[PDB]
Amino acid sequence: EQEAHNKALNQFKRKLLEHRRYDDQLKQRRQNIRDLEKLYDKTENDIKALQSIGQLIGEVMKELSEEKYIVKASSGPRYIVGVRNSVDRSKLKKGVRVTLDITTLTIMRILPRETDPLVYNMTSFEQ
Amino acid sequence: GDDELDQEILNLSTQELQTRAKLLDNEIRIFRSELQRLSHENNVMLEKIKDNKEKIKNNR
Amino acid sequence: TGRDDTKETVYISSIALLKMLKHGRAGVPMEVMGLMLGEFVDDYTVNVVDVFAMPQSGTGVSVEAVDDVFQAKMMDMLKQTGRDQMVVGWYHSHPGFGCWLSSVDVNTQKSFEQLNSRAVAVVVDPIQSVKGKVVI
Amino acid sequence: EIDTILSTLRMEADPSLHPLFEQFEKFYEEKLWFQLSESLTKFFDDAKSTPLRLRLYDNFVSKFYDKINQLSVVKYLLASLKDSKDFDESLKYLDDLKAQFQELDSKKQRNNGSKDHGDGILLIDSEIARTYLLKNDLVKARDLLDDLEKTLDKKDSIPLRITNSFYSTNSQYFKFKNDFNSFYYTSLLYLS
Amino acid sequence: MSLQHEKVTIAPLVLLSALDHYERTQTKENKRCVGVILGDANSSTIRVTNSFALPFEEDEKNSDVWFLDHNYIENMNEMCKKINAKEKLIGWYHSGPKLRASDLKINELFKKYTQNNPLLLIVDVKQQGVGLPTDAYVAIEQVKDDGTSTEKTFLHLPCTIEAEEAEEI
Amino acid sequence: MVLEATVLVIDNSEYSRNGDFPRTRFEAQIDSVEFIFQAKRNSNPENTVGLISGAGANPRVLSTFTAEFGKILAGLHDTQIEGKLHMATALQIAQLTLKHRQNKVQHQRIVAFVCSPISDSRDELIRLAKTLKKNNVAVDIINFGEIEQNTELLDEFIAAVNNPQEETSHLLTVTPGPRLLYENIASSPIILEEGSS
C-alpha cells in the first residue's frame, strides 16, 4: 500500500459498491413492476370479458309500427322486439343484421352483414 | 471502484475521502427507504394477479 | 315440538327484491348466486334487510362456488359501518327452469341448513319478470 | 463567493437599497431558503427597471435551483426578460431552464416523491411566445400559441399564474393587429 | 377534467339504499352520511347503478372537521368489481338537507380516484317536496366577470330517473 | 410503553425543503417515521401506528393504524410539500382517528412533528389541550421548528394536559441544527414514555 490509512479506504471502497448496487436495484424493481403490470392488465381485460354476456343476431324483416319491429332471429323463429334510443328508425332498414339481447330482446345497435365462414377460404386461396 | 481508492490518494486528500464515506452513509439510507417501498408494492401486486386469474381458472 | 315449527314467512324489503333482480338479470343466461342478510324474530318471521352476491363461476351454482374469502371479507366491510346482521339464507337463479330447487341446490341447502336451520333458498326468475308480475 | 458579485450591485444602488442585499446573504448562510424567497420578492417590486435586477437573478439561478422554491425562480424569469432589451439572450435563458427540468425530474420526482416540473414548463413556453411577439414575428408567435392552448386545456386544474401569463400574450398579439373585438374578451379574462 | 354530466339518470335502487344506510348508522341531529357512488361515466347521461356506505364521522363543532377512511374505499371497490366490472367511482352522495361549502373540499378528495368529474349527489333523506328528493351538482372551476379568480363552485345538474327493465317491474 | 396506538401528524411546509439536516428536512422525516414505527412494533406486535398529513390545506388521512410499515411508507410517497399544517384542525382529526380502531385495548398517543413556526391562536389551543385530558389522550410535541424563530406557545399546552393518567403528554425538544433528526428522536423517550399516575 501507499498509506496505512488505505486500510480505512478498503472499508469505503466496500460501501461504494453497495451504493451503486442499490441504484441498480431501484430500476430493477421498476422494471419488474412493469412486467407485473402487463400481466395484471392481461388478466384484468379477461375479467371485463367474462362479466359481459352475449347477444343474438337477427335482421329487420319488416317494420311493424314505430317502436315495434318484426325481426327474424338467427335462431330462426321471428320475434317482436323493441328499440333503444341508441338506434334510430332511419338507421334500421330491411335486410340489415341487427343485434338483439337475449333477455330483453331489444335492438341495441346496428351490425354489418353476416358473411359465411366458408367464403373466406375462397378469398384466401389464389396461390 | 473509481472513487475512494489508491487512485484517489493521488487525486484527492484522504480526509476528504473520510468525509466522502459518511456521505455515502447518508445516500444509502435514502435509497434503502426507496427499496423497501418497491418491495411492499410488489407484494400488493402479486395478489392482485392471483385474484383475477383464479376466476379465469373456473371457466377454463 | 315446544315451538311453532313452521317455515318463516319471508318478508323481503323494498331494497332487496330490486337488488336480487338487478343482480340476476345481468347474468342471464348463466346462473347467479348470493346471500340474503336479515334478522330472525318470531318463530316464523324473517325480515330480509339486504343482499350481497357471491362472485360468478365457470360451473355456475355449486357448493364449491361458495368462497369463504368473499363472504367473510364483504361481511367485514359492512361491519365497519354497522349494517351487517347475520346470514338468514341465500338466493340463486334458475332462469332456464321454473321455481324449484335443482338437484345440486338441495345439497347446498343441506350445508346451509347445518350452519343455520332457518336457512332459506329463494329462486329468482329474472327472465319471467319481463311481465307485469315478478316470479319469485 | 457570492458576496463579491453582490458587492458590485451594492455599490451602484442607493445607500437606502444597500441593506436589502445584506439580508439576502444573511439568509443564505443560515440555509433558510423560504426566508430568502420572501426577501428576493421585495427588491423586484420597486426595482425591476434596474439592470441590477437582471444581474441579481442570473447569479441566483446558478447557486439556487433546488434551494429556494422552483416557482419563484421561473416567475422571476418572466420578469427578467421584460427588463432585457435583448431577444437572442432571452431565447438562450429560456431553453437552458427548460432543458434543466427534463433531466432533473427523473431524479427529483422519485426521491422526494413529489414536485412537478411541468408547471415551470408552461410558464416557460408562455415566455417564448411573448418573445416572438416582441420580435414581431407574428406568424411564428401565433402558431406556437395554438399549440400551447391545446396543451393548457389538457391539464385539469390550472394555477392562476399560468393562465394569467397565457392571457397576456393573447392580449399583446391582438392589439398589434388592431382587432378591437378579439382584444376585448381576452382582456376580461386577464383582469379577472 | 371534463363536463359530460348533462343528464344524470338515477336508479331507484340507489335512493332506497341511501335511506337504509342513513338509518343503520343512525346519523341524526345534523349528522351526515357519505357513501361512494358506483356506476358508468364517459357518457352524457350518468348512470347511477349502485352505492355503498363509507365510514365517515362528521363533526358538530365545525363543518370543516371530518374523518374519512381512504383505505376503506379501495376494498369496497375491488369486491364490487368482482360482481360486475362496469362499476367505478363516479362520485359520492351527501345526505344532508341541502348544500354546503365544506363539501367542496371533500369533492376534491374524490377527484383522486375518479377519471371523471366527481358527482355530488345530495340524496335527501327528508323527502322534502312533491318532486324529486334529488338535486345533483358537480364541482367545476370557473373565472367570472366580477373580478373573481379561480372559483370552485357547484353547478346544478337537472335530475332525471331511469330504471332497468328488471328494476322497474 | 406498549399496547399503544400512535397517530403521526407529519408537517408539510416549505420550512422542510430548507437545509437543516443533510439533504432536505423532508428527507429526514421519512427515516424518523420508520424509526418510530419499528420501535413500537419490536417491543410488542399489538402496537399499530398510522399516518395523517397536513398536505392539502386540510389534513387528510394517508393510512389508518397498521402493523405494515410498507403501508405508512407508500403513503408518505404521496404528498404535497406546499401544503400547510394547521394545528387546531389536526388535533381534532387525530382525536377522531383514535376513535376509529379495531380494538380499544390500546393507549391513546399522538406524536406530532412541528416543522413550521406555529401561527395558530393560543386561546383556542388551550381548550383543545384540555379536551385531550378528559379522553385519556396524551400528546408528544416534537419541537424543532418553533424554537428556530418563534415564541414557545406549545410548551404551555403540555403542562395543561398533565394529570394523573395512564399515558400523559411529553415535551421533546429536538435541535434544529444538523445532528440527524432520526438519531435524536430515537434517543428521546418514545417507548419508555411513562404515565403520571
Q: What is the DSSP string of D137-179?
A: -HHHHHHHHHHHHHHHHHSSS--HHHHHHHHHHHHHHHHHHT-
Give the β-pairing of F60-66 and F48-53: antiparallel
Q: How many CA atoms does the CB half-sphere of D21 hold within 13 Å?
A: 24
Closest CA to A91 of A70, A115, A56, A60: A60
Which chain B residue has the Cα nearest residue C62? B58
Tell me which chain F residues have a C-beta less than 8 angstroms from the C-beta of D69.
14, 17
Asked if A15 contacts B27 with a C-beta cutoff of 8 angstroms, the reply is no
Closest CA to F137 of F91, F182, F83: F91
Asked if D122 contacts D162 with a C-beta cutoff of 8 angstroms, the reply is yes
The C-alpha atoms of residue F103 and residue F98 are separated, in whole angstroms, by 11
CA distance E46 to chain D (A): 20
The C-alpha atoms of residue A100 and residue A57 are separated, in whole angstroms, by 6
Give the neighbours of chain F: at least 3 Cβ pairs within 8 Å: B, D, E
Cell of C27: 347474468
State whether residue B44 sits within 8 Å of chain A by CB. no
The C-alpha atoms of residue A123 and residue F185 are separated, in whole angstroms, by 78
Residue F62 amino acid letter: L
The C-alpha atoms of residue F33 and residue D58 are separated, in whole angstroms, by 39
User: Which stretches within F64-107 are classed as H helix?
Assistant: 69-77, 87-98
B contact set with F (CB within 8 A): 23, 26, 29-30, 33, 36-37, 39-41, 43
Q: A103 and C30 in contact by Cβ < 8 A? A: no
Q: Which one-letter DSSP state was computed for residue D63?
A: H
Tell me which chain B residues have a C-beta less than 8 angstroms from the C-beta of A5.
14
Query: Domain residue spans in chain E?
Result: 3-169
Beta bridge partners of C87: C37
Matching residue, cell 490518494:
B9
Kindly tell me whether chain A and chain C come into contact, counting contact as 3+ Cβ pairs under 8 Å: yes
Beta bridge partners of A75: none
Task: Give chain C's count of helices (H) and strands (E).
Answer: 3, 5
Q: C74 and E12 in contact by Cβ < 8 A? A: no
Cell of D117: 416540473
Find the helix packing angle between D88-112 and F25-43, rounded to 10°. 10
CA distance B44 to chain A (A): 11
Matching residue, cell 367511482:
E89
Of C18, C49, C129, the CB nearest to E13: C18
Asked if D77 contacts D127 with a C-beta cutoff of 8 angstroms, the reply is yes
Task: Give chain D's count of helices (H) and strands (E).
Answer: 10, 0
Residue F136 gets the label, from left (phi > 0), alpha (psi -120 to 50) or beta, of: left
The C-alpha atoms of residue F145 and residue E6 are separated, in whole angstroms, by 49
State whether residue E71 sits within 8 Å of chain F by CB. yes
Q: Which one-letter DSSP state was computed for residue C118?
A: T
Residue C82 gets the label, from left (phi > 0), alpha (psi -120 to 50) or beta, of: left
Matching residue, cell 379561480:
E150
Closest CA to F138 of F160, F122, F116: F160
The C-alpha atoms of residue A68 and residue A81 are separated, in whole angstroms, by 6
Q: Which residue out of F51, F96, F98 would a mutagenesis test of the E interface target, given it has the greatest number of E Cβ atoms within 10 Å? A: F96
Cell of F184: 435524536
Tell me which chain E residues have a C-beta less than 8 angstroms from the C-beta of A48.
85-86
Which chain E residue has the Cα nearest residue A49? E85
CA E142, distance to chain mean position in Å, is: 21
The C-alpha atoms of residue F188 and residue F35 are separated, in whole angstroms, by 12
CA B33, distance to chain mean position in Å, is: 8
Q: Which residues contact B20 (CB under 8 A, 6 or more apart)?
A: A12, B3, B4
Q: What is the 3-state secondary structure (H, E, C) of chain B?
A: CCCCCHHHHHHCCHHHHHHHHHHHHHHHHHHHHHHHHHHHHHHHHHHHHHHHHHHHHHHC
Give the β-pairing of E148-157 and F4-10: unpaired
Cell of F179: 445532528
State whether residue E85 sits within 8 Å of chain A by CB. yes
Q: Which one-letter DSSP state was computed for residue C53?
A: P
Asked if A15 contacts B31 with a C-beta cutoff of 8 angstroms, the reply is no
Asked if F22 contacts F180 with a C-beta cutoff of 8 angstroms, the reply is yes
Q: E143 and D189 in contact by Cβ < 8 A? A: yes
Closest CA to C93 of C19, C11, C10: C19
Asked if E119 contacts E103 with a C-beta cutoff of 8 angstroms, the reply is no
The C-alpha atoms of residue E113 and residue B58 are separated, in whole angstroms, by 31
Q: Which one-letter DSSP state was computed for residue C56?
A: P
User: Which stretches within C1-136 are classed as H helix?
Assistant: 14-27, 68-81, 103-115
The DSSP string of chain E is -----SEEEE-HHHHHHHHHHHHHTT--TT---EEEEEE--SSSEEEEEEEEE--EEE-SS-SS-EEE-HHHHHHHHHHHHHH-TT-EEEEEEE-SSS--SSHHHHHHHHTTT-SSPPEEEEE-SS--SSS-SEEEEEEEEEEETTTEEEEEEEEEE-EE----HHHH-
Determine the CATH number of domain E3-169: 3.40.140.10
The C-alpha atoms of residue D182 and residue F98 are separated, in whole angstroms, by 58
Backbone angles phi, psi at B38, to 5 degrees: -80, -25
Which chain E residue has the Cα nearest residue F92? E65
Cell of F143: 419541537
Which chain A residue has the Cα nearest residue C125? A103
Task: For residue F59, say if its preceding peptide bond is cis, omega within 30 degrees of 0.
Answer: no
Record the resolution, in angstroms.
Answer: 6.3
The DSSP string of F102-161 is S-S-SEEEEEEEE-S---S-HHHHHHHHHHHTTTTEEEEEEESSHHHHS---HHHHHHHH
Query: Domain residue spans in chain C?
Result: 7-136
The string over F113-126, giving b where at least 16 C-beta atoms fall within 10 Å of a residue's C-beta and e elsewhere, is bbbbebebeeeebe
Tell me which chain A residues have a C-beta less than 8 angstroms from the C-beta of E165.
104
Closest CA to B37 of E76, F34, A81, D175: F34
The C-alpha atoms of residue D44 and residue D33 are separated, in whole angstroms, by 17
Matching residue, cell 389538457:
D154
> What distances in angstroms separate CA E128 from CA A11, C51, E16, E131, one per listed residue?
77, 28, 15, 8
Burial category of F197 from C-beta neighbours within 10 Å (exposed 0-12, middle 13-18, buried 19 and up): exposed
Find the helix packing angle between B14-59 and A9-50, rounded to 10°. 20
Cell of A93: 332498414
Matching residue, cell 464515506:
B21
Give the β-pairing of F137-143 and F107-114: parallel
> What distances in angstroms separate CA F138 from CA C85, F59, F87, F91, one per listed residue?
36, 20, 15, 11
Q: Which residues contact D14 (CB under 8 A, 6 or more apart)?
A: none
Residue A35 amino acid letter: D
Cell of A26: 431501484
The DSSP string of chain A is ---TTSTTHHHHHHHHHHHHHHHHHHHHHHHHHHHHHHHHHHHHHHHHHHT----EEEEEEEE-SSS-EEEE-TTSSEEEEEE-TTS-GGG--TT-EEEE-SSS-EE--B-PPP--STHHHHTT---
Cell of C122: 329463494
The string over D139-159, giving b where at least 16 C-beta atoms fall within 10 Å of a residue's C-beta and e elsewhere, is eebeebbeebeeeeeeeeebe
Matching residue, cell 414557545:
F152
The C-alpha atoms of residue D114 and residue D105 are separated, in whole angstroms, by 10
Which chain C residue has the Cα nearest residue E72? C77
The C-alpha atoms of residue F11 and residue F158 are separated, in whole angstroms, by 19
CB neighbourhood size of E76 (10 A):
21
The DSSP string of E69-87 is -HHHHHHHHHHHHHH-TT-
CA distance D108 to chain B (A): 13
State whether residue C73 sits within 8 Å of chain B by CB. no
CA distance E80 to chain D (A): 28
CA distance F67 to chain B (A): 13
Give the β-pairing of E56-58 and E66-68: antiparallel
B contact set with C (CB within 8 A): 55, 57-60
Q: Which residue out of A103, A104, A105 would a mutagenesis test of the C interface target, given it has the greatest number of C Cβ atoms within 10 Å? A: A103
Q: Which of residues 3-32 of E touch C (CB under 8 A)?
A: 11-13, 16-17, 20-21, 24-25
Q: What is the 3-state secondary structure (H, E, C) of F129-140?
A: HHHHCCCCEEEE
Asked if A70 contacts A62 with a C-beta cutoff of 8 angstroms, the reply is yes
CA distance C58 to chain B (A): 4
Cell of E57: 364521522
Asked if F78 contacts F48 with a C-beta cutoff of 8 angstroms, the reply is no
Of D34, D111, D113, the CB nearest to F18: D34
CB neighbourhood size of D110 (10 A):
15
Backbone angles phi, psi at A11, to 5 degrees: -75, -30
Cell of A34: 412493469
The C-alpha atoms of residue F66 and residue F52 are separated, in whole angstroms, by 13
Give the β-pairing of A69-72 and E45-53: unpaired
Residue A59 amino acid letter: E
CA B34, distance to chain mean position in Å, is: 6
Q: Which residue out of B45, B46, B54 would a mutagenesis test of the A interface target, given it has the greatest number of A Cβ atoms within 10 Å? A: B45
Closest CA to A47 of C53, E48, C55, C93: C55
Tell me which chain A residues have a C-beta less than 8 angstroms from the C-beta of B49.
36, 39-40, 43
Q: F73 and B36 in contact by Cβ < 8 A? A: yes
The C-alpha atoms of residue D121 and residue A6 are separated, in whole angstroms, by 48
Technique employed here was cryo-EM
Asked if F88 contacts F74 with a C-beta cutoff of 8 angstroms, the reply is no
Instruction: Reduce the DSSP state of residue F173 to 3 states and report it.
Output: strand
The C-alpha atoms of residue B6 and residue B28 are separated, in whole angstroms, by 23
Asked if E138 contacts E153 with a C-beta cutoff of 8 angstroms, the reply is no
Q: CA geometry: angle at F110 spanning F104 and F113, to 5°?
A: 155
Tell me which chain D residues have a C-beta less than 8 angstroms from the C-beta of B34.
110-111
CA distance B60 to chain C (A): 7
The C-alpha atoms of residue D64 and residue D70 are separated, in whole angstroms, by 9
Cell of F129: 389541550
Lateral strand order in the sheet of E34-39: E148-157, E134-144, E119-123, E88-94, E34-39, E45-53, E7-10, E159-160
Residue D172 amino acid letter: Q
Q: B60 and C59 in contact by Cβ < 8 A? A: no
Q: F78 and D113 in contact by Cβ < 8 A? A: yes
Asked if F97 contacts F89 with a C-beta cutoff of 8 angstroms, the reply is no
